[PDB]
Design a protein around this ligand. Sequence first.
Ligand code: HEM
Length: 153
Amino acid sequence: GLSDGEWQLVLNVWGKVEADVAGHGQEVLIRLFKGHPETLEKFDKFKHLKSEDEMKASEDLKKHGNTNLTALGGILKKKGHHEAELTPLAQSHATKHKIPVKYLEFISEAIIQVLQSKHPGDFGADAQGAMSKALELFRNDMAAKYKELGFQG
Ligand code: HEM
C-alpha cells in the first residue's frame, strides 16, 4: 500500500544505497548483529566474529551484506508488484535459513538506522515515513508467504 509519491521517495533514497551497496550492506549487518546479538547465530560462517572490529574486517560479512541489499533493492524497485522477487527470498529464509519474522523487523530497523546515519540530509521526515512503509510492506508480504508455506508469520 504506498502511494506513487511514497515509492518515489523510497527509490530516491535507495539511489544513495545504489551508489555504494556493499558499504551500506556491511553497515546494516554490523548494526543488526551489534544491536541484536542473537541474529549472528543464524550465520554459521560468522561465529568467530567476536567484536565490531572483526566484523568490519570480514570480507565474507561485507559480501553477504552486498548480496542482501542488492536483493532488497530488486524488491523495492518493483514497488509492491514484487511477488516474483519476494517469493524465493521468503522460501529460502523460512526453510533453509530459519529466520523468524521478528528478525526481519530488527534488520528493517538497522536499514533505517544506517540510512539516517549516512544520509541525514536526504532522509528527512517524508523519506523516512515512506521507507518505513516500504519495509513494513516487505515484512508483511514475507510474513504472509511464510504462512502459505506452513510456517509462522
Ligand atoms: C532485508 C532482509 C533480507 C534480505 C533482502 C536478505 C537477502 C538474502 C539473500 C539475497 C541471500 C542469498 C540467497 C538466499 O539464500 O536467499 C541471503 C542469505 C542468507 N540470509 Fe538473508 N536476507 C535478509 C534478512 C536476513 C536476516 C534478518 C537473517 C538472519 C538474521 C538472514 C540470514 C541469512 C542467511 C543465514 C543466509 C545464508 C548465508 C550463508 O549461506 O552463509 N537474512 N539473504
